[PDB]
Design a protein around this motif. Structure first.
Motif, PDB file in Angstrom:
ATOM      1  N   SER A   1       0.821  -1.206   0.000  1.00 39.72           N
ATOM      2  CA  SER A   1       0.000   0.000   0.000  1.00 39.72           C
ATOM      3  C   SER A   1       0.859   1.260   0.000  1.00 39.72           C
ATOM      4  N   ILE A   2       0.641   2.122  -1.000  1.00 37.27           N
ATOM      5  CA  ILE A   2       1.400   3.366  -1.108  1.00 37.27           C
ATOM      6  C   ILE A   2       0.870   4.460  -0.198  1.00 37.27           C
ATOM      7  N   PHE A   3      -0.176   4.186   0.574  1.00 34.42           N
ATOM      8  CA  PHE A   3      -0.797   5.178   1.436  1.00 34.42           C
ATOM      9  C   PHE A   3      -0.580   4.829   2.902  1.00 34.42           C
ATOM     10  N   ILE A   4      -0.512   5.864   3.730  1.00 30.15           N
ATOM     11  CA  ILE A   4      -0.476   5.721   5.179  1.00 30.15           C
ATOM     12  C   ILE A   4      -1.863   6.081   5.693  1.00 30.15           C
ATOM     13  N   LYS A   5      -2.583   5.090   6.210  1.00 34.61           N
ATOM     14  CA  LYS A   5      -3.936   5.325   6.699  1.00 34.61           C
ATOM     15  C   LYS A   5      -3.882   6.068   8.029  1.00 34.61           C
ATOM     16  N   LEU A   6      -4.438   7.277   8.056  1.00 36.08           N
ATOM     17  CA  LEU A   6      -4.476   8.091   9.271  1.00 36.08           C
ATOM     18  C   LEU A   6      -5.757   7.743  10.014  1.00 36.08           C
ATOM     19  N   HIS A   7      -5.654   6.786  10.933  1.00 35.58           N
ATOM     20  CA  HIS A   7      -6.829   6.299  11.643  1.00 35.58           C
ATOM     21  C   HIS A   7      -7.437   7.400  12.505  1.00 35.58           C
ATOM     22  N   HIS A   8      -8.745   7.299  12.723  1.00 37.14           N
ATOM     23  CA  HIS A   8      -9.474   8.295  13.498  1.00 37.14           C
ATOM     24  C   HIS A   8     -10.819   7.745  13.961  1.00 37.14           C
TER      25      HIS A   8
END
Ligand SMILES: CC[C@]1(O)C[C@@H]2CN(CCc3c([nH]c4ccccc34)[C@@](C(=O)OC)(c3cc4c(cc3OC)N(C)[C@H]3[C@@](O)(C(=O)OC)[C@H](OC(C)=O)[C@]5(CC)C=CCN6CC[C@]43[C@@H]65)C2)C1
Ligand SMILES: Nc1nc2c(ncn2[C@@H]2O[C@H](COP(=O)(O)OP(=O)(O)OP(=O)(O)O)[C@@H](O)[C@H]2O)c(=O)[nH]1
Ligand SMILES: Nc1ncnc2c1ncn2[C@@H]1O[C@H](COP(=O)(O)OP(=O)(O)CP(=O)(O)O)[C@@H](O)[C@H]1O
Ligand SMILES: Nc1nc2c(ncn2[C@@H]2O[C@H](COP(=O)(O)OP(=O)(O)O)[C@@H](O)[C@H]2O)c(=O)[nH]1
Ligand SMILES: [Ca+2]
Ligand SMILES: [Ca+2]
Ligand SMILES: [Ca+2]
Ligand SMILES: [Mg+2]
Ligand SMILES: [Mg+2]
Ligand SMILES: [Mg+2]
Lengths: 341, 54, 429, 437
Positions: free
Chosen positions: A334-341
């Motif tokens: 995955s090229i994205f960093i999931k910013l959890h919230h």
């Protein structure tokens, strides 16, 4: 066979997203005014959101969040950060800003009250005036010259007098981050950012070394392309510079603040723009622009609702849009960093 | 947050809650448009019956 | 009540018209003697649209049978349901029309037309609220083509506020070998362009192809062809004869299907395509939906993918999932949205009737106003011009008083009709 | 006591009116034959329900209603329906041939031949009224009668009753159940000619009702009967203040006062909750806060639109059942901090609230479950203009090619009335954008 329409020809990002969808053999492009689409790559202004989600038997998705202009306009952003309790006027990562209307049409008196406190307090009193109608920017220390220039809607914010300067060059820069919010309001940060650096030394006492715009650095700047190609320093080179020159990392010294600011902005407007229980779904790609001072503090400059990508990163970012934002709603065969919230 | 004008009775009650203060043509003209349209119908039918007579 | 008056003219018109009454009588539970023997109140709810009620609870078709020769109408009277028609509604001459449009329209037919209009007037006077007329006829012959279009023009004079609908059989060299049929058809199309509100184009070219290629009928007869016509006519009139919400009368159908007054020529379609005496495997809703839109199921030899749909009506018959019908109908429009004009939103309407036709668990009928119908008129126009450029066979028509200029005008009108379909095929939003 | 007369035009207006008067009888305990045992003043009185029902010496309670349809098969259902004894034949008016989905045919051609008879039958009911407030007009936008005859009737009502209020219940067209391609034409034609004659109009999008029936009632393919029973619940909630004791929206004038500050912007958005399937053997009864928060969910609105991207001018909450003012004030406070509720600057951010202790009445055997408390929110938001934009765009696509226009010209209408109606609608969209943006 999924269907999509294209209503913005000047979008270099979504022109490539269109090229990728057709290359799958499972997406067909229709005419721009054909209402029987699954996906709309809409226009920038006056997108007819009111017409979406009214086609029986069609799940419809659009590449813009209605109401996201509140975050992507100069005067709108300042008003949002000042009036939202989640962000508050005591927000530490946004430079002290004031919305100034021209006299032929407001926070003029409030702008002068905090201005005289800096002159009395022997503090650095340099401000900058700008607006969303730019290519027209003035950087001055006297408030009498700033207010006269706006009358000729703008915003005035504190100019970061002490920016982080790369070496060799003693030069300014800014960081662009690409953020993708999907239909579930998952916030994805593209792992690759860019540093649009200045090629001229910063002179704290001309607007070539101060404004780090890619067009201005390719015009008025004489040392264009000297230190880095196209004045674009990528994260691998910048992480190595921070390790060799400051004994820190990009992740620790900057990215944590960046991810924090991204989450704070997008969570603030989530109740106003979420399409969770709506008859159509939205996603949108955002371009966040940050500044770093000498103390390695990150400041938010603005948010772009229709961002352009860097030449090297077009293929990977546009492919991630299809995977995370488009094919998540319309699965293929995955090229994205999931910013959890 | 202020409730004002509470009215009550046996079948229910009503009130107002304030959260923040604030910051024709005549019959003659109708018949003239109706008859002008009926005139256009009769003219169109007349041109048809003329066409069919030819 | 909204009554329809049916007229059948000439050989083709009387044979197809007789099969129509035979088929819908069975659907409404009427026997050859006019007595109701059905087991459902839905058969009688709108029975008055096509039938009159008489003494002894007898149902008489509101039908008028017209011919310039007694041959076919003697065959009808001795046919299966021949005793059901009103005997005074048989209006016939003795001379025939000799496959000559001029004889049907100007000489032989003029002598008989007034007695037809008397029977029409008698039927129209006993109607609570007549909605209009339907005519069955061919365009390639003389009586149905020539006298039929004379009848349409004279009926329109007496009832200018009523709907005129025709089932018009287009000629084909694959079925008939009389050389003047392109003349008769071109002269008729000019009449239909001006004097009908809706025309169902029943192309003998397409009926031959269905029977020969699809049903593998290597020696096709007119009974084979008329089996397709009967099923189609039953299907396109279902919304008139049974309770329903969509296109329940002729005028509401015309408002939905005719965006411009001259473009009122419909391509009919039907599924499943079946021969007489042939159905073990029931058809599914996805199969009905794909077949009714298939070019091979069209009753007009025109490729729908060569044009665009202005308007479409779809009628499903039988006990089925109305949810699944909606899903399949939406799928076709969403998966083939290019062949529908975008400047007419939601131009596809769907109706469902629980009563299926005879011998079929479920069926679907297609009614399309497609610009591809220009291929039919181009075909006739090319056959017309090949002869007319040398005035070949014209003496058969000038011998009846006609002038060559009347042929030039019919040819020009039909080529104008083709141009009009072509302009709405290229228009864009 | 001041009377209200209901007028039902076309198939949609008549079939919805039939569902409403059936529900009115169940709510007031009026038997199918018109007998109301709880009514002790036989042959008269001035109770609150008498605003909708008159009384005969024999004790029959008769709706103050007129049914008009240019074709008789729909009203014939009323003449032989369950509540056939409620109405006398003078109230049921039928023609022979309908308007064939053609505004011009219903307004000019066929309307001219029955307009005088309808007004005469209306005048007969008005003569029984000691103090007529005005009229409630039920019709569809899409039909030829509902669009064409209604606009003609409203123009004549403004002439013969210039001081009486007129409210609309209008069915907005939806392709999932529509039966005509020209319904965008008919909707904009009738809105243009009725706008200056209507004081307050409650639009109901068939698409919203259809999806609520599919989603919340588990109906795979909703019928008109399914849609009309739900519509009657919303209409009942709106008119309950006229038929019962109370102090909010007690007369027709108060609807305009409470909901319509700008006369042209008189289309309040209705939202209803809860809609619970009766097929469920048990369902958790929702609280005051839950049903009130659902009033700000688009899936519960009578027109799909996003009120977050607009501004409010007024907002009324109409509760029925086990509701006390304490729980309402708490729900409003919780919702204000979680929702994007923006009022116009020249209006107070406030809510008018009405509570009726009688819980909602459902039709026995219907699809709706009995609930202990329900609410209908009437909010005048600029977001409802999304429905005008959808309608105007479909109009523009067809009118650019003049498709079907010949059907209207052929009935006596001029092509200029199309563009005149469309320019009026363009001005309406401009008004909405000024107030809401
Ligand atoms: C549906 C009504 C119909 O029965 C259909 C065809 C014809 N007619 C009359 C009956 C008939 C047919 N053939 C006949 C031969 C002698 C006498 C009578 C017939 C008929 C058939 O059943 O074939 C087995 C038929 C006829 C034709 C026919 C097909 C056909 O049935 C299969 N055609 C397609 C044409 C025809 O011109 C053609 O182009 O064939 C390719 C065909 O030519 C050839 C080489 O076969 C032919 C054959 C007699 C030749 C001269 C002109 N006519 C015009 C129509 C066409 C025919 C079938 C009416
Ligand atoms: N909710 C609801 N909508 C209806 C009902 N009946 C018709 N409609 C809608 O109304 C529109 C069609 O208008 P109608 O009221 O049926 O037509 P009309 O008023 O009788 O006018 P005519 O053309 O003369 O038949 C379509 O959009 C239908 O979906 C109904 O009973 N309930
Ligand atoms: N308060 C501030 N302090 C320091 N530098 C600032 C500043 N505001 C703006 N700048 C400088 O000005 C540059 C351009 O500002 P800005 O981003 O508003 O122009 P812009 O928005 O038209 C380009 P983009 O749309 O890509 O963000 C920034 O990259 C930064 O170097
Ligand atoms: N489908 C079909 N076509 C027919 C029938 N009878 C004749 N035709 C066609 O009609 C044309 C001849 O016209 P016809 O009706 O026989 O002449 P009329 O009696 O003068 O009207 C030719 O094109 C035939 O192919 C029939 O029963 N069914
Ligand atoms: Ca003679
Ligand atoms: Ca009483
Ligand atoms: Ca008025
Ligand atoms: Mg910018
Ligand atoms: Mg013959
Ligand atoms: Mg009707």
């Amino acid at each position: 066979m999924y269907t999509f329409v294209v209503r913005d020809e000047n979008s270099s990002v979504y022109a490539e997203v269109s090229r990728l969808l057709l290359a799958t053999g499972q997406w067909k492009r229709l005419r721009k005014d054909n209402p029987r689409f699954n996906l709309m790559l809409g226009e920038r202004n006056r997108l007819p959101f009111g017409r979406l989600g009214h086609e029986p038997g069609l799940v419809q998705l659009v590449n813009y969040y209605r109401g996201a202009d509140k975050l992507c306009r100069k005067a709108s952003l300042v008003k949002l950060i000042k009036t939202s309790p989640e962000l508050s006027e005591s927000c530490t990562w946004f430079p002290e800003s004031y919305v100034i209307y021209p006299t032929n049409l407001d926070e003029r008196e409030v702008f002068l009250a905090a201005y005289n406190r800096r002159r009395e307090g022997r503090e650095g009193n340099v401000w900058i005036a700008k607006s969303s109608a730019g290519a027209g920017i003035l950087i001055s220390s006297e408030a009498s010259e700033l207010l006269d220039f706006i009358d000729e809607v703008h915003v005035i914010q504190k100019y970061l007098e002490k920016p982080l300067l790369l070496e060799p060059g003693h030069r300014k820069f800014d960081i662009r981050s690409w953020v993708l919010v999907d239909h579930l309001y998952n916030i994805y940060l593209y792992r690759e950012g860019v540093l649009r650096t200045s090629s001229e030394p910063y002179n704290s006492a001309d607007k070539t070394c101060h404004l780090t715009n890619h067009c201005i650095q390719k015009e008025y700047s004489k040392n264009y392309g000297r230190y880095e190609e196209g004045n674009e320093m990528f994260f691998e080179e910048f992480n190595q510079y921070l390790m060799d020159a400051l004994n820190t990392t990009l992740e620790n010294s900057i990215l944590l603040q960046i991810k924090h600011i991204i989450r704070s902005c997008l969570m603030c407007i989530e109740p106003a723009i979420s399409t969770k229980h709506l008859h159509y779904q939205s996603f949108q790609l955002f371009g966040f622009d940050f500044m770093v001072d000498e103390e390695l503090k990150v400041w938010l400059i603005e948010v772009n609702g229709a961002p352009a990508c860097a030449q090297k990163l077009y293929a990977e970012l546009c492919q991630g849009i299809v995977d995370v934002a488009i094919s998540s709603v319309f699965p293929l065969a995955s090229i994205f960093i999931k910013l959890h919230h | 947050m202020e409730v004002i004008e509470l009215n009550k009775c046996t079948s229910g009650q009503s009130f107002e809650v304030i959260l923040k203060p604030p910051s024709d043509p005549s019959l003659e003209e109708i018949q003239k448009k109706l008859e002008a349209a009926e005139e256009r119908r009769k003219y169109q039918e007349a041109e048809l019956l003329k066409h069919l007579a030819e | 009540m909204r009554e329809i008056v049916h007229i059948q003219a000439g050989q083709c018109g009387n044979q197809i018209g007789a099969k129509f009454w035979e088929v819908i009588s069975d659907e409404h539970g009427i026997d050859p003697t006019g007595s109701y023997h059905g087991d459902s109140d839905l058969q009688l709810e709108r029975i008055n649209v096509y039938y009159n009620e008489a003494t002894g609870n007898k149902y008489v078709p509101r039908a008028i049978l017209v011919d310039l020769e007694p041959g076919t109408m003697d065959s009808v009277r001795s046919g299966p349901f021949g005793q059901i028609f009103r005997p005074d509604n048989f209006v016939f001459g003795q001379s025939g029309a000799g496959n000559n449009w001029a004889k049907g329209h100007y000489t032989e037919g003029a002598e008989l037309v007034d007695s037809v209009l008397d029977v029409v007037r008698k039927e129209s006077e006993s109607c609570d609220c007549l909605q209009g007329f339907q005519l069955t006829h061919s365009l390639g012959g003389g009586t149905g083509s020539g006298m039929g279009t004379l009848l349409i023009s004279k009926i329109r004079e007496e009832y200018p506020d009523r709907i005129m609908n025709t089932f018009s059989v287009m000629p084909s060299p694959k079925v008939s070998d009389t050389v003047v049929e392109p003349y008769n058809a071109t002269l008729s199309v000019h009449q239909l362009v001006e004097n009908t509100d809706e025309t169902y184009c029943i192309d003998n070219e397409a009926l031959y192809d269905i029977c020969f290629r699809t049903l593998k009928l290597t020696t096709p007869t007119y009974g084979d062809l008329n089996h397709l016509v009967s099923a189609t006519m039953s299907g396109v009139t279902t919304c008139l004869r049974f309770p329903g919400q969509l296109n329940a009368d002729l005028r509401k159908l015309a408002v939905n299907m005719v965006p411009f007054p001259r473009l009122h020529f419909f391509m009919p379609g039907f599924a499943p395509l079946t021969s007489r005496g042939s159905q073990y495997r029931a058809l599914t809703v996805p199969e009905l939906t794909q077949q009714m839109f298939d070019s091979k199921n069209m009753m007009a030899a025109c490729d729908p993918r060569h044009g665009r749909y202005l308007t479409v009506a779809a009628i499903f018959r039988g006990r089925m999932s109305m949810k699944e019908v909606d899903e399949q109908m939406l799928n076709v429009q969403n998966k083939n949205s290019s062949y529908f004009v975008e400047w007419i939103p939601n131009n596809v309407k769907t109706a469902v009737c629980d009563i299926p036709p005879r011998g079929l668990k479920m069926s679907a009928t297609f009614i399309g106003n497609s610009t591809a119908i220009q291929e039919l008129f181009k075909r006739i126009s090319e056959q017309f011009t090949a002869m007319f450029r040398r005035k070949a066979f014209l003496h058969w028509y000038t011998g009846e008083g006609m002038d060559e200029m009347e042929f030039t005008e019919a040819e020009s009108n039909m080529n104008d009709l083709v141009s009009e379909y072509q302009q709405y095929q290229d228009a864009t939003a | 006591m001041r009377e209200c007369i209901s007028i039902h035009v076309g198939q949609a207006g008549v079939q919805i009116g039939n569902a409403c008067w059936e529900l009115y009888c169940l709510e007031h305990g009026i038997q199918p034959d018109g007998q109301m045992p709880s009514d002790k003043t036989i042959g008269g009185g001035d109770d609150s329900f008498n605003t909708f029902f008159s009384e005969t010496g024999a004790g029959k309670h008769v709706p103050r209603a007129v049914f008009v349809d240019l074709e008789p098969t729909v009203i014939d259902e009323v003449r032989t329906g369950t509540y056939r004894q409620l109405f006398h034949p003078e109230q049921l008016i039928t023609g022979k041939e309908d308007a064939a989905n053609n505004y011009a045919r219903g307004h000019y051609t066929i309307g001219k031949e029955i307009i005088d008879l309808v007004l005469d039958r209306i005048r007969k009911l008005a003569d029984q009224c000691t103090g007529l407030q005005g009229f409630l007009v039920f019709h569809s936008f899409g039909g030829g009668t509902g669009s064409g005859f209604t606009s003609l009737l409203m123009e004549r009502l403004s002439v013969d009753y210039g001081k009486k209020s007129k409210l609309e219940f209008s069915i907005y067209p939806a392709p999932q159940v529509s039966t005509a391609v020209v319904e965008p034409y008919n909707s904009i034609l009738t809105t243009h000619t009725t706008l200056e004659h209507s004081d307050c109009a409650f639009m109901v999008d068939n698409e919203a009702i259809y999806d609520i029936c599919r989603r919340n009632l588990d109906i795979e393919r909703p019928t008109y009967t399914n849609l009309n029973r739900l519509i009657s619940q919303i209409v009942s909630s709106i008119t309950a203040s006229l038929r019962f004791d109370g102090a909010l929206n007690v007369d027709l004038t108060e609807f305009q006062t409470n909901l319509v500050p700008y006369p042209r912007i008189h289309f309040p958005l209705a939202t209803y909750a809860p809609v619970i399937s009766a097929e469920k053997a048990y369902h958790e009864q929702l609280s005051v806060a839950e049903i009130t928060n659902a009033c700000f969910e688009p899936a519960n609105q009578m027109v799909k639109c996003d009120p977050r991207h607009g501004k409010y001018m007024a907002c009324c909450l109409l509760y029925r059942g086990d509701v006390v003012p304490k729980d309402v004030n708490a729900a409003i406070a919780t919702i204000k901090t979680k929702r994007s509720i923006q009022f116009v600057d020249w209006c107070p951010t406030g809510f008018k609230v009405g509570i009726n202790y009688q819980p909602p009445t459902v039709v026995p055997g219907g699809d709706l479950a009995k609930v202990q408390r329900a609410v209908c929110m009437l909010s005048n938001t600029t977001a409802i203009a999304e429905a005008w934009a959808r309608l105007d765009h479909k109009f523009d696509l067809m009118y650019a090619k003049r498709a079907f226009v010949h059907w209207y010209v052929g009935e006596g209408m001029e092509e200029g009335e199309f563009s005149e109606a469309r320019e009026d609608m363009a001005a309406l969209e401009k008004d909405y954008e000024e107030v809401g943006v």
